[PDB]
Write a protein that binds this ligand. Structure first.
Ligand SMILES: [Mg+2]
Ligand SMILES: [Mg+2]
Ligand SMILES: [Mg+2]
Ligand SMILES: [Mg+2]
Ligand SMILES: [Mg+2]
Ligand SMILES: [Mg+2]
Ligand SMILES: [Mg+2]
Ligand SMILES: [Mg+2]
Ligand SMILES: [Mg+2]
Ligand SMILES: [Mg+2]
Ligand SMILES: [Mg+2]
Ligand SMILES: [Mg+2]
Ligand SMILES: [Mg+2]
Ligand SMILES: [Mg+2]
Ligand SMILES: [Mg+2]
Ligand SMILES: [Mg+2]
Ligand SMILES: [Mg+2]
Ligand SMILES: [Mg+2]
Ligand SMILES: [Mg+2]
Ligand SMILES: [Mg+2]
Ligand SMILES: [Mg+2]
Ligand SMILES: [Mg+2]
Ligand SMILES: [Mg+2]
Ligand SMILES: [Mg+2]
Ligand SMILES: [Mg+2]
Ligand SMILES: [Mg+2]
Ligand SMILES: [Mg+2]
Ligand SMILES: [Mg+2]
Ligand SMILES: [Mg+2]
Ligand SMILES: [Mg+2]
Ligand SMILES: [Mg+2]
Ligand SMILES: [Mg+2]
Ligand SMILES: [Mg+2]
Ligand SMILES: [Mg+2]
Ligand SMILES: [Mg+2]
Ligand SMILES: [Mg+2]
Ligand SMILES: [Mg+2]
Ligand SMILES: [Mg+2]
Ligand SMILES: [Mg+2]
Ligand SMILES: [Mg+2]
Ligand SMILES: [Mg+2]
Ligand SMILES: [Mg+2]
Ligand SMILES: [Mg+2]
Ligand SMILES: [Mg+2]
Ligand SMILES: [Mg+2]
Ligand SMILES: [Mg+2]
Ligand SMILES: [Mg+2]
Ligand SMILES: [Mg+2]
Ligand SMILES: [Mg+2]
Ligand SMILES: [Mg+2]
Ligand SMILES: [Mg+2]
Ligand SMILES: [Mg+2]
Ligand SMILES: [Mg+2]
Ligand SMILES: [Mg+2]
Ligand SMILES: [Mg+2]
Ligand SMILES: [Mg+2]
Ligand SMILES: [Mg+2]
Ligand SMILES: [Mg+2]
Ligand SMILES: [Mg+2]
Ligand SMILES: [Mg+2]
Ligand SMILES: [Mg+2]
Ligand SMILES: [Mg+2]
Ligand SMILES: [Mg+2]
Ligand SMILES: [Mg+2]
Ligand SMILES: [Mg+2]
Ligand SMILES: [Mg+2]
Ligand SMILES: [Mg+2]
Ligand SMILES: [Mg+2]
Ligand SMILES: [Mg+2]
Ligand SMILES: [Mg+2]
Ligand SMILES: [Mg+2]
Ligand SMILES: [Mg+2]
Ligand SMILES: [Mg+2]
Lengths: 59, 296, 171, 159, 208, 23
RNA sequence: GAGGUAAAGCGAAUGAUUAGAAGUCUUGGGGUUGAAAUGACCUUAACUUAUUCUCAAACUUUAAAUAUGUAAGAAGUCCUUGUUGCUUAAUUGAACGUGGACAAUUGAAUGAAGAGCUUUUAGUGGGCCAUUUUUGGUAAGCAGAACUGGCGAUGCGGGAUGA
RNA sequence: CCUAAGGGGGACUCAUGGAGAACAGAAAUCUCCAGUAGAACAAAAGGGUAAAAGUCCCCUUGAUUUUGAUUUUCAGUGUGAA
RNA sequence: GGUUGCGGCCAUAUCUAGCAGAAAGCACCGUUCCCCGUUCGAUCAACCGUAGUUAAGCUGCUAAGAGCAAUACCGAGUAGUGUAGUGGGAGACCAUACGCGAAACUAUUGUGCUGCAAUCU
């Protein structure tokens, strides 16, 4: 039979009708993939930090 | 008829090694393995025990590496030993032990870990590592850097190793390179190691040589002869020296007979200085004219 | 100064080679001869590759050689120069200042003959050098030797003629 | 037969620089990377562990993870009509701090220094950058520089 | 056997030279590029005449051989075999391909011949001779022009023979001792490098 | 006893270049 | 920041490649001077040295244009000191924080019928053409890629006529 | 295809050229010097590698266990591989 | 300023050939009982600093040096290229317009800088 093999023609037209959008930025990135040893300890540091601020305001 | 090899293209495409590798002084493979620190400890440095031997001196330094260059923490030289009571044999295995003990004590003095981490106060030659104190700061950790010097059981670098370990520094190591290690029966004969710590091999050489060749004893052991120092009181030379090293391990610089400026002015008088462009142009013109006499 | 004490020529090493073309008993007896002459256990060299014309194969133990230094080297060298009746050629000296010769029977050196051992020829090479060659052989700070301190053919020839009262031909 | 392996087409990208092969200078191993640092990515062909894919060679990103010998870098890659967040683990031999931070962080300091000085002097200062503007008027002196007249030159052959 | 040259006139493909990738390549028809008195010194033949291409084009090795033969024959017949030094300045390094020797499936061709890829202003043939032999050498090249496709110009060089110096700079460098013979070519003095070797090579160097 | 060790790397040599007859 | 294409280069590596010149104790040969000495001479051919003509998609020191990654702040910068079982010899750091200072030129331009987000579903999944880059082929109104713009899906004015 | 051709450590430095040594010659073995890699790294090719990643020696099983995260192809599914 | 130890950048530091080097340092250098490694105390190990030497290493200087580095009324606004026209030319290709813009070449200049510690006429 034999047909068209490949072409990227018209593909940039389609990507730019509604896309080519930069990703949104957030204040807190996800910690997925961050070192488990750091992540394990970072849990304890944040928990203790919340307690200290809670007591200071309770005063 | 062979091709001349050293062409201009050979020099053009030649890639020169690192300056201190071409000097044959730094093993950068070993240096990379020693220096590189866990990236999650960020700015905490690794400390090296640099041990270098010259023909006359033993240099022991505690070094941390930085981008602008290495930075010395403390340093003990073998030529500091006469202050502590060792005047001859400044390259013994025992002089190496003394230099290691001195650098360990001096570093601990600089840090403040003197009363804590005293070390092995009663040297019996047993293998031992500086153990941490519970509910206290960990011992100063240092890694041994022997440079290009070969690792052999009995080498002098491990004398500094044992001294630094006995001085209170935590230096990770094994005893199978100490003098007195039986490779067949994998245990350390601590008696022979203790013998080596207090100059026992040198004293035994003095005793064995004296009754077999008095003339050679007179030439090899001159300094001992004019000081009337025999073999039996060698150990005391070290045993006292140890105590003195622990009493005041602080660095006392040599009083300088001249100031820095006077030294610089004296040295600046010698060593030729480069010719001006005009001078060498005149030299070229003279050489051209003086070449005219071989025109045939 | 060209007349410096440390510029003194003297022998670095003497290397004794017997390249018996085969492996087995004959090579073993050549090794026995070398261990007898030098007093040190010699080392056997293996063929780097296979040649059918020479009857050798790769990694077949072909030759045996030994290196001697010090007074024993001097004694063996003069013992071999006696066999050569103290007469080498100019062509026997390399451009790097080393020289060599080859004896044809090892009983001419002055050792006992055994019918089991037989006679082997032998190859002598002497490596000359002044003091300070350790610079090129030490591990740390290895460097090269300056041109004046280098050993060359003329200095070695003159030193050999002076020290042995021998003749260096050039046929 | 098509070939599309991991390092296909990287013959020159992953080459060492001319007369720069061999051992890595140790400032590479002494640099300190913190989470949030901006780093350029350039694969070193002589270190094959922790090596980036050929896509990230020449890309710049944010460090998000720091491990024993490596950093995790966040890259935004175009996949069709949007960006996908990519998290690449790279040994520090293939990483260098981005020099774009140091220019902007200095302009922040310069703006802060200039503002307090004008505040100290009780005057005002304008800190917004400006593009190059058309040049002003000027007077050209002709003492020693009387105009020299040029003409187009005739055609010549020089072979 | 051989197709008409019109099938291979234009540089449509990338250069396809002999390599480890194409090995069954025939030889170029032209093998000799220097003719006449090629051992003559530079001073013997001051006049240089070029045949220059006014086309970005491909010239077959067959055409190169034919034009070389035509020019050589004419100039040696009219002025003698020792009155000139002819040099062919283009080497055919590009391999042409032929397909038939089904249809378009697997149509990658086999080596068929060799051609030189020339640009505009590129010299094809150079002839160094004496001035009095100008009109001969020109007529030798103009006939050779007929063996080539496209447009060529016969241009008299401003330079002395095959040297890169003009006919006035060569005389200046000659009376100053800055030129020495090297057989058919010359070597020029350098003010860089070992002074002694430079002085030895040019004894007649009037230094200033 | 002892034997010379292979300082070279020509593992699959088994012959040598330059070694041409008639030369 | 990245790149290795255009160009350029080959008295720069690799590979190809024209011509002489001067030299050397494996010169490769012919005639020799030689009674024979390998020890000269005439010669051609090898190499070496400094040169010479011409080249490379799967060569290259150098090296564009176009195109490409990141940044240009309030989620910023600086100061002090809280948390942890992580880290340091440590009172060192790491991360997250309390408190304080820097106010509209809050840190380039230009624009912005506003930005962001979600669900669901149609048709389509034969393409073709023009400029430029470009592969196979002698070429093709041939076959195949790159970017963009078009025709398809589109009338209108021009090209007589014509996707 | 590989119990090493995997892993760690150590020592050494390959292709090749020149000058020399009985048999020995173009090619056997020995010596020095030169030697930016012109070698070798199972195999196609490209990249990478010199106090090594090459050659030789010593010790070994990390060619092991639990599963997560990530990169490539990508629909950001699988598989393979990392 | 010299020197050593450890370095950063990694030839302005390399390569070749000459010449010079006070002090200290470094080095060569002397020895083999001991730990240790070798065919060989040559390398490696250990001992002495005692018998000697700056001959070499190292350092500095010299060279119309090779190489390397930097600069430019050098070449050259050339080659190439983004964009444009119902421009030229049968074509191959070329000119013009708004922009970007090399490499080779030529000339000149330079030939390590520097951090920590110790030491020295
Ligand atoms: Mg079909
Ligand atoms: Mg289809
Ligand atoms: Mg849009
Ligand atoms: Mg370098
Ligand atoms: Mg090591
Ligand atoms: Mg045989
Ligand atoms: Mg195929
Ligand atoms: Mg393919
Ligand atoms: Mg690159
Ligand atoms: Mg791997
Ligand atoms: Mg303001
Ligand atoms: Mg084509
Ligand atoms: Mg023909
Ligand atoms: Mg069919
Ligand atoms: Mg024509
Ligand atoms: Mg091999
Ligand atoms: Mg074989
Ligand atoms: Mg490419
Ligand atoms: Mg090109
Ligand atoms: Mg080109
Ligand atoms: Mg070029
Ligand atoms: Mg070339
Ligand atoms: Mg050249
Ligand atoms: Mg050059
Ligand atoms: Mg070539
Ligand atoms: Mg000659
Ligand atoms: Mg003849
Ligand atoms: Mg440049
Ligand atoms: Mg570049
Ligand atoms: Mg660019
Ligand atoms: Mg505080
Ligand atoms: Mg706050
Ligand atoms: Mg701006
Ligand atoms: Mg739908
Ligand atoms: Mg849909
Ligand atoms: Mg659908
Ligand atoms: Mg549907
Ligand atoms: Mg169709
Ligand atoms: Mg359909
Ligand atoms: Mg269009
Ligand atoms: Mg057009
Ligand atoms: Mg088509
Ligand atoms: Mg069709
Ligand atoms: Mg349709
Ligand atoms: Mg329309
Ligand atoms: Mg109409
Ligand atoms: Mg119409
Ligand atoms: Mg019409
Ligand atoms: Mg391996
Ligand atoms: Mg292994
Ligand atoms: Mg291994
Ligand atoms: Mg190793
Ligand atoms: Mg080479
Ligand atoms: Mg497995
Ligand atoms: Mg996958
Ligand atoms: Mg798949
Ligand atoms: Mg996917
Ligand atoms: Mg996936
Ligand atoms: Mg998967
Ligand atoms: Mg000064
Ligand atoms: Mg001195
Ligand atoms: Mg010795
Ligand atoms: Mg030693
Ligand atoms: Mg000296
Ligand atoms: Mg000297
Ligand atoms: Mg120069
Ligand atoms: Mg210069
Ligand atoms: Mg254009
Ligand atoms: Mg463009
Ligand atoms: Mg156009
Ligand atoms: Mg018109
Ligand atoms: Mg223009
Ligand atoms: Mg220099």
């Amino acid at each position: 039979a034999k047909s068209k093999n490949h072409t990227a023609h018209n593909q940039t037209r389609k990507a730019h009708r509604n896309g080519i959008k930069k990703p949104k930025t957030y204040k807190y990135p996800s910690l997925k993939g961050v070192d488990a040893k750091f992540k394990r300890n970072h849990r304890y540091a944040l928990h203790g930090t919340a307690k200290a601020l809670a007591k200071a305001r309770a005063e | 008829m062979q091709k001349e090899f050293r062409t201009s293209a050979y020099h053009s495409r030649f890639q020169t090694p690192f300056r201190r590798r071409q000097e044959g002084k730094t093993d950068y493979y070993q240096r990379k393995r020693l220096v590189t620190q866990h990236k999650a400890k960020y700015n905490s440095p690794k400390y090296r025990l640099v041990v270098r031997f010259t023909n006359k001196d033993i240099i022991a330094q505690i070094v941390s590496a930085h981008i602008t260059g290495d930075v010395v923490f403390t340093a003990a030289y073998a030529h500091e030993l006469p202050r502590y009571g060792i005047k001859y044999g400044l390259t013994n295995w025992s002089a190496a032990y003394a230099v290691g003990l001195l650098v360990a004590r001096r570093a601990l003095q600089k840090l403040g870990l003197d009363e804590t981490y005293t070390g092995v106060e009663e040297v019996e030659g047993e293998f031992e590592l500086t153990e941490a104190v519970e509910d206290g700061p960990r011992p100063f950790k240092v890694f041994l850097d022997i440079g290009l010097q070969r690792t052999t059981t009995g080498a002098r670098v491990f004398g500094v190793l044992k001294g630094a370990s006995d001085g209170g520094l935590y230096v990770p190591h094994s005893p199978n390179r100490f003098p007195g290690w039986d490779i067949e029966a994998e245990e350390l004969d601590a008696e022979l190691l203790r013998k080596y710590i207090f100059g026992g091999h040198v004293a035994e050489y003095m005793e064995e040589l004296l009754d077999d060749d008095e003339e050679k004893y007179k030439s090899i052991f001159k300094n001992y002869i004019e000081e009337e120092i025999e073999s039996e009181d060698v150990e005391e030379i070290y045993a006292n020296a140890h105590e003195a090293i622990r009493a005041d391990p602080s660095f006392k610089p040599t009083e300088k007979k001249f100031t820095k400026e006077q030294y610089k002015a004296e040295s600046k008088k010698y060593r030729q200085q480069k010719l001006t462009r005009a001078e060498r142009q005149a030299k070229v013109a003279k050489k051209i004219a003086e070449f005219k006499a071989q025109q045939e | 100064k060209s007349q410096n004490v440390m510029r003194e020529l003297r022998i670095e090493k003497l290397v004794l080679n017997i390249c018996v073309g085969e492996s087995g008993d004959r090579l073993t007896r050549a090794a026995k001869v070398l261990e007898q002459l030098s007093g040190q256990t010699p080392v056997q060299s293996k063929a780097r590759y296979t040649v059918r014309t020479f009857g050798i194969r790769r990694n077949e133990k072909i030759a045996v050689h030994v290196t001697v230094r010090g007074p024993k080297a001097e004694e063996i060298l003069e013992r071999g120069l006696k066999v050569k009746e103290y007469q080498l050629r100019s062509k026997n000296f390399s451009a790097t200042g080393n020289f060599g010769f080859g004896i044809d029977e090892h009983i001419d050196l002055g050792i006992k003959y055994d019918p089991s051992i037989g006679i082997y020829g032998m190859d002598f090479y002497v490596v000359m050098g002044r003091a300070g060659a350790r610079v090129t052989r030490r591990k740390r700070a290895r460097s090269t030797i300056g041109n004046s301190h280098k050993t060359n053919k003329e200095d070695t020839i003159q030193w050999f003629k002076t020290r042995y009262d021998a003749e260096v031909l050039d046929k | 037969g098509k070939s599309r392996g991991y390092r296909s087409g990287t013959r020159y990208a992953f080459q060492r620089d001319f007369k720069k092969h061999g051992a890595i200078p140790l400032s590479t191993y002494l640099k300190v990377y913190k989470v949030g640092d901006i780093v350029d990515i350039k694969a070193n062909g002589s270190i094959q562990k922790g090596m980036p894919h050929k896509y990230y060679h020449g890309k710049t990103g944010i460090v998000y993870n720091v491990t024993k010998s490596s950093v995790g870098v966040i890259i935004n890659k175009v996949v069709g009509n949007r960006y996908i967040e990519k998290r690449v683990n790279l040994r520090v031999e293939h990483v260098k701090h981005s020099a774009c931070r140091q220019e902007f962080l200095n302009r922040v300091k310069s703006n802060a220094a200039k503002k307090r000085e004008a505040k100290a002097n009780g005057e005002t200062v304008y800190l917004k950058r400006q593009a190059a503007k058309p040049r002003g008027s000027r007077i050209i002196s002709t003492e020693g520089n009387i105009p020299q007249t040029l003409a187009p030159v005739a055609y010549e052959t020089f072979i | 056997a051989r197709r008409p040259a019109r099938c291979y006139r234009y540089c449509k493909n990338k250069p396809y030279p002999k390599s480890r990738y194409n090995r069954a390549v025939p030889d170029a028809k032209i093998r000799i590029y220097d003719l006449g008195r090629k051992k003559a010194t530079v001073d013997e033949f001051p006049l240089c005449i070029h045949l220059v291409s006014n086309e970005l084009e491909q010239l077959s090795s067959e055409a190169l051989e034919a034009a070389r033969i035509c020019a050589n024959k004419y100039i040696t017949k009219v002025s003698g075999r020792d009155s000139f030094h002819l040099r062919v300045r283009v080497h055919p390094f590009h391999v042409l391909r032929i397909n038939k020797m089904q249809g378009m499936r697997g149509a990658w061709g086999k080596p068929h011949g060799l051609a030189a890829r020339v640009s505009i202003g590129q010299i094809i043939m150079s002839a160094r001779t004496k001035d009095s032999n100008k009109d001969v050498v020109i007529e030798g090249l103009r006939r050779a022009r007929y063996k080539f496709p496209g447009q060529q110009k016969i241009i008299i060089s401003k330079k002395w023979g095959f040297t890169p110096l003009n006919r006035d700079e060569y005389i200046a460098k000659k009376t100053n001792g800055e030129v020495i013979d090297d057989g058919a070519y010359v070597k020029f003095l350098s003010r860089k490098g070992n002074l002694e070797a430079n002085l030895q090579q040019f004894p007649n160097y009037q230094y200033s | 006893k002892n034997t010379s060790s292979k300082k070279s790397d020509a593992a699959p040599a088994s012959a040598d270049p330059a070694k041409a007859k008639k030369k």
